From a paper:
The Spike protein (S) is the major surface glycoprotein on coronaviruses. These characteristically trimeric spikes are subdivided into an N-terminal S1 domain, responsible for attachment to host cells via its receptor ACE2 (Hoffmann et al., 2020), and a C-terminal S2 domain, which is anchored in the viral membrane, cleaved from S1 following cellular attachment, and responsible for membrane fusion and cell entry. S1 consists of an N-terminal domain (NTD) followed by the receptor binding domain (RBD) which mediates binding to ACE2, burying ∼860 Å of surface area at its tip (Lan et al., 2020). Most potent neutralizing antibodies bind the RBD on or closely adjacent to the ACE2-interacting surface and function to block interaction of the virus with ACE2, preventing cellular adhesion and infection (Dejnirattisai et al., 2021a; Yuan et al., 2020; Kreye et al., 2020).
First we determined the crystal structure (at 2.3-Å resolution) of Fab 278 in complex with Victoria RBD and Fab 222 (STAR Methods). Neutralization and binding of mAb 278 are affected for B.1.617.1 and B.1.617.2, and we inferred that the mutation of RBD residue 452 was responsible. The structure confirms that neither RBD residue 478 nor 484 contact the antibody and that binding abrogation is mediated by direct contact between the 16-residue-long heavy chain (HC) complementarity determining region (CDR) 3 and RBD residue 452, which could not accommodate the major increase in side-chain size in going from leucine to arginine in the variant viruses. (C) Residue D108 of H3 forms salt bridges with R346, K444 and a hydrogen bond to N450. (D) L1 hydrogen bonds via S31 to R346 of the RBD, and Y32 hydrogen bonds to the carbonyl of D442. L3 forms backbone hydrogen bond interactions between Y92 and K444, T94, and G446. Although REGN10987 and mAb 75 bind at a similar site as mAb 278, and all three antibodies overlap the ACE2 binding site (Baum et al., 2020; Dejnirattisai et al., 2021a), the engagement is sufficiently different that neither REGN10987 nor mAb 75 directly contact RBD residue 452. We solved the structure of a complex of the RBD with mAb 278 and confirm that this antibody contacts L452, explaining its loss of activity on B.1.617.1 and B.1.617.2.
Numbering used by the authors:
A (entry chain E): 333 to 527
B (entry chain A): 1 to 134, 140 to 220
C (entry chain B): 1 to 213
D (entry chain H): 1 to 138, 144 to 225
E (entry chain L): 1 to 214
């Protein structure tokens, strides 16, 4: 029984933009959550529907590790029952979410002198995302009566916005890397157990 | 023409409710960030509320739990229900598209509607002529004893604009407002040009046209 | 919660001069979160500059924004009489916040006011009240003194004053002083006069009328 | 297939300006940013600045600020670079380069480059070369020709009207401080055949219709 | 302005060798480091981006590593089409993109000392008012070679330029010309003209010289 590939997610060189968040399926392995509790300076570590001390014992059928980058002020939106541009239009947790949300400051990796163009978020969307939905559409957003046909202009907005992370921004505007763990618990045999 | 038309302001007693309307043409309210911004008399701008296209609503902490933003998709209209109104709520309320965030600023704005929270009673104004005397002459109108604000005054149905000065209203010791609208015209056109001030006091549905002629 | 304060409170400059409006914060706000709005009297605010430096649509070239972090600057090169307004900076942390605003006044040459006096109307006299209006038209600076004399006696405590905002074209002010009397008290005096003292006048100007004439 | 086709080689005089174009194809032009990187002869690459196709936002390098201008003709999928007040040190090959685009991040890397536009800044006009002999020293010996003070490039040098190519080295042309190009061609030959075999270099300069045949023989 | 440096400044290798090129930044650039290949006369081509991820269409023998200030480009087995100049580039500053100086990789061969020749200026050139003295370094390897002019035992500076041929296809050697440019008046005021070559294949520097006149 080999170790679950948590290092590949937490130690990715580059993270995904929140609108195109990454998901890693984790199965048929053995995970170690105790090391993750004291793995670094995880500013956020909130578990929902399960206890972090109990995580090192329970087994699960499937475990998903979703990862992305957001603003510091937006970290509060990665939680059940939240609203905002992130929870509504980029990454949505269900109300009965069973898992943990892990976030840490990454201003030394994901910011650029002059602003980083590499990280984006969906600013415009007609409706809210369903839980765990992923919308990578880059259609020009129609804000008026007349359709756009890929032409930007008045009432025709490119739907994604860059954060422009700079190393000198305040904490609320700095980049934060987020890892969301989900613990699917089906009637199938469990394949992911702690140690 | 893109435009946001506001309506529903006016006088309301303390503790009463009131709904504002922002009728939009040129943008789909349901597809935009739509915000309300108010401005107390003499003070600055304060953000009040926002509704997202997806339906999420947010409120500044000073109104959160008393105001309710909403919209009607078919009517392309933004609403703001204001309950338990008090003195802190007397302001010119503006609607705007956007939320003041990057790629999403407040634009365009509505003309703004005034909400006056007061226990006083509505009263329409009496309009009196400020007749010229006997180069350049001066005449005007006196719009006295009305409540609440505002009163609009034009001359010759908007034909005469140059030289027109309409003074801000002053609160008289009786609790009723009063102002004057004056205009300087050449002395030679006094006996040939009819000068009429058009006073509109919407709160009391008082439309008054007044002919200002020499004595 | 980033708090942003504007300086100075009011700015007075001549046309053609360079206006410097500052907006400073208690946190390093990125330039992309800063915007400026211009509100002229009676009108709604207008989006002036967004992204700290990007001029909005239809905004003249003289308006330019710059700055980053904890200090942002609105520059109005070649100031014009129509630039009379209040300018608000605005930013977004977890909600939209507005600055206190900076009023931009416009200096000009001293202009003496044109003084006019108006007796009350017969229509108003039929109602039982009498209002006497004294008009100071198109002057500068705003400091003016209006004294009411009724039968040569200085009257105080029964008049109110209203001053217009600075004119968006000639940058002058206009002022009205309204003496409020009852019909009974009005018919008891003959000589009504308002005396206007102003910097543009070498001596005070008195405009008077005799009741009935 | 992504393609960036730049305008042809330019020869400008000191103080003038040059506008280099870059025609794009095979991708959505607006979704990407175009950078301009120049390379002086025998130097490293140097980023002049960049232009975003959607909005027209520009960032310039501080030493070119106020002197360079980049524009985007979205109607013809063409980017332009304009450099004014040209000096001698602006002589370089100028590349356009698109980045990964708004989705992967502007300016994060340059995945496609144009073929390069050579811009030569010199005060000189079209001048034919002077050809001087490199006398063979008095068993292999070397002789050659000095092709000096011509403009612009290029010259072509052959020996004995093409009958002698073995052991020939024609060097790259340098741009002297005078604004004229210089170059020399040499060939090693048997030290025994000096006073018997004739060695003639053939210099041809098409930009001036100049054709010089110079005999190289030992000096007495 | 972040400065990018590369080492070695030049590199000799054979087909099948494991090549390693180092890049250094004057301050932390995180992972915003790219590698480019450039062959003579052609445009640069992207090899590595994000310090270690491979571009589409690039062979698997190319790899990158590094984060912060020290970065490494590795070619596991060199192929003939890999001899070129390799540049690194930082994208940490979107206000000032900077490149490394470039490391040229050439074909390794055995040492070969240059054949050194010196040519006095022709009498035809002296009639024009300028004197050019040419020193020729023919068929040598490696590329590193120092050429020093001595006019009456005095080193010259700022008055010589040198051109080099591309590495030869047959014998993989170089040839270099050093041209000392003097004014006609300056040239006639001295007698001994000499060019001294220092090369790896010479156990001691070779000096070819002439006296003006003889
Ligand atoms: C990815 O991890 C490497 C190495 O981290 C090691 O394993 C971790 C689980 C943790 O236990 C670390 O303490 C281990 O060192 C990181 O590289 C290290 O970076 C630090 C500071 O930059 C440096 O002092 C170390 O020498 C590096 N270690 C090695 C082996 O190179 C790397 O930063 C991580 N990547 C990201 C994106 O976080
Ligand atoms: Cl938000
Ligand atoms: Cl779940
Ligand atoms: Cl009013
Ligand atoms: Cl202007």
């Amino acid at each position: 029984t080999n170790l679950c590939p948590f290092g590949e997610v937490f130690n990715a060189t580059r993270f995904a933009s929140v609108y195109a968040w990454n998901r890693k399926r984790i199965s048929n392995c053995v995970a170690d959550y105790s090391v993750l509790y004291n793995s670094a300076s995880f500013s956020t570590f909130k578990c929902y529907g399960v206890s972090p001390t109990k995580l090192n014992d329970l087994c699960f059928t499937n475990v998903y590790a979703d990862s992305f980058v957001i603003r510091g002020d937006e970290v509060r939106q990665i939680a059940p029952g939240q609203t905002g541009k992130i929870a509504d239009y980029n990454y949505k947790l269900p109300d009965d979410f069973t898992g943990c949300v892990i976030a840490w400051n990454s201003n030394n990796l994901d910011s650029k002198v002059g602003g980083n163009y590499n990280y984006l978020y969906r600013l415009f969307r007609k409706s809210n995302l369903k839980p765990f939905e992923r919308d990578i559409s880059t259609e020009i957003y129609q804000a008026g009566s007349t359709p756009c046909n890929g032409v930007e202009g008045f009432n025709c907005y490119f739907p994604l916005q860059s954060y422009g992370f700079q190393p000198t921004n305040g904490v609320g505007y700095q980049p934060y890397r987020v890892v969301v763990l989900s613990f699917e618990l089906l009637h199938a045999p469990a394949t992911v157990c702690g140690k | 023409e893109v435009q946001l038309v506001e309506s529903g302001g006016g006088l309301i007693q303390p503790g009463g409710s009131l709904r504002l309307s922002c009728a939009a043409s040129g943008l789909t309210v349901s597809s935009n960030y739509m915000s309300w911004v108010r401005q107390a008399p003499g003070k600055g701008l304060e953000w009040v509320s926002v509704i997202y296209s997806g339906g999420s609503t947010f409120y500044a902490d000073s109104v959160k739990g008393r105001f309710t933003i909403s919209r009607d998709n078919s009517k392309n209209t933004l609403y703001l229900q204001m309950n338990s109104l008090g003195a802190e709520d007397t302001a010119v309320y503006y609607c705007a598209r956007g939320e003041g965030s990057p790629g999403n600023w407040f634009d365009p704005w509505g003309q703004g509607t005034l909400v006056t929270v007061s226990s006083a009673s509505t009263k329409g104004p009496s309009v009196f002529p400020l007749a010229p005397s006997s180069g350049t002459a001066a005449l005007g109108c006196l719009v006295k004893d009305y409540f609440p604000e505002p009163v609009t005054v034009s001359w010759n149905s908007g034909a005469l604009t140059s030289g027109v000065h309409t003074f801000p209203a002053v609160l008289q010791s009786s609790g009723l407002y009063s102002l004057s609208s004056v205009v300087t015209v050449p002395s030679s056109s006094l006996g040939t040009q009819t000068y009429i001030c058009n006073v509109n006091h919407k709160p009391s549905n008082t439309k008054v046209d007044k002919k200002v002629e020499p004595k | 919660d980033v708090v942003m304060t504007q300086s100075p409170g009011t700015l007075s400059l001549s046309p053609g001069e360079r206006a410097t409006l500052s907006c400073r914060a208690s946190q390093s706000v990125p330039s992309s979160y800063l915007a400026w709005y211009q509100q002229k009297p009676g009108q709604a605010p207008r989006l002036l500059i967004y992204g700290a430096s990007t001029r909005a649509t239809g905004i003249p070239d003289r308006f330019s924004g710059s700055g980053s972090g904890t200090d942002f600057t609105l520059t109005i090169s070649r100031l014009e009489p129509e630039d009379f307004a209040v300018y608000y900076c605005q930013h977004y942390d977890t909600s939209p916040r507005f600055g206190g605003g900076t009023k931009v006044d416009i200096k000009r040459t001293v202009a003496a006011p044109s003084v006019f006096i108006f007796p009350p109307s017969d229509e108003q006299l039929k109602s039982g009240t009498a209002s006497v209006v004294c008009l100071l038209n198109n002057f500068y600076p705003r400091e003016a003194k209006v004294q009411w004399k009724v039968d040569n006696a200085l009257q105080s405590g029964n008049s109110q004053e209203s001053v217009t905002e600075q004119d968006s074209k000639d940058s002058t002010y206009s002022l009205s002083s309204t003496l409020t009397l009852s019909k009974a008290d009005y018919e008891k005096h003959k000589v009504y006069a308002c005396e206007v003292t102003h910097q543009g006048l070498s001596s005070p100007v008195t405009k008077s009328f005799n009741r009935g004439e």
